[PDB]
Design a protein around this ligand. Structure first.
Ligand SMILES: Nc1ncnc2c1ncn2[C@@H]1O[C@H](COP(=O)(O)OP(=O)(O)OP(=O)(O)O)[C@@H](O)[C@H]1O
Length: 210
């Protein structure tokens, strides 16, 4: 059907590390579309004076004019956060049944997957692609050996069908951090070139991260 990616993050703010990983994810999987999915979180876990809807605008500024990168605001429009599985069915509810869905997660995040609500069902709806990288020691928890055993493919090209498997991918993400960027901004410095230019212009224009 279509090759559709899903890239979830808090994005506070969205920066070139995310965007450059997005770019690479797509090109590797020949995605028709890669969807950035800003997650929703309790109001009190937002950066003070940076709202959900501003996080969402920057993500929009960042993919505007960018082919095949779009934004999915559905978590960002609920009554409160959701579990991922819930996002997944909602996404899938609007898909064609042969469309292939690829959820991109980080190694460290994948390592805590058995704590996600109803985790056993996630691969019902998508493929999970796990970012491997120089900083997260590839030592899977014993709680994930049987899952990786039943559903992982060593070749990403071998992901098949609209979902059901796990593969691993290697990237060297830029040494850009949203935490570093906030501090630079708090310190009054220039994060120019550490974030997409349309994101830079938004941060500046709206005097965000103070
Ligand atoms: N440079 C990086 N390379 C690619 N993706 C990264 C990078 N840093 C974090 N991520 C991604 O960041 C996304 C959401 O923002 P997140 O706050 O988790 O990142 P962060 O840079 O570690 O921010 P923070 O510094 O506040 O922890 C995640 O979905 C994750 O994949």
């Amino acid at each position: 059907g279509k090759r559709i990616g899903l890239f979830g993050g808090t994005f506070d703010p969205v920066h070139i590390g995310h965007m450059r990983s997005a770019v690479e994810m797509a090109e590797q999987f020949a995605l028709d579309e890669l969807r950035l999915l800003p997650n929703a979180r309790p109001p009190h876990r937002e950066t003070p004076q940076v709202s959900a809807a501003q996080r969402l605008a920057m993500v929009e500024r960042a993919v505007a004019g960018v082919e095949r990168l779009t934004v999915d605001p559905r978590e960002l429009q609920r009554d409160k956060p959701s579990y991922t599985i819930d996002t997944l069915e909602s996404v899938r509810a609007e898909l064609a049944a042969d469309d292939q869905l690829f959820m991109l997660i980080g190694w460290d995040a994948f390592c805590g997957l058995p704590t996600w609500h109803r985790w056993e069902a996630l691969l019902d709806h998508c493929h999970i692609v796990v970012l491997q990288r120089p900083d997260a020691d590839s030592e899977p928890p014993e709680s994930l050996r049987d899952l990786l055993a039943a559903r992982s493919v060593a070749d990403p090209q071998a992901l098949k069908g609209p979902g059901g498997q796990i593969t691993f991918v290697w990237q060297t993400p830029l040494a850009v951090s949203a935490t570093q960027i906030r501090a630079l901004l708090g310190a009054g410095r220039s994060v120019r070139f550490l974030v997409p230019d349309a994101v830079l212009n938004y941060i500046e224009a709206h005097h965000l991260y103070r």
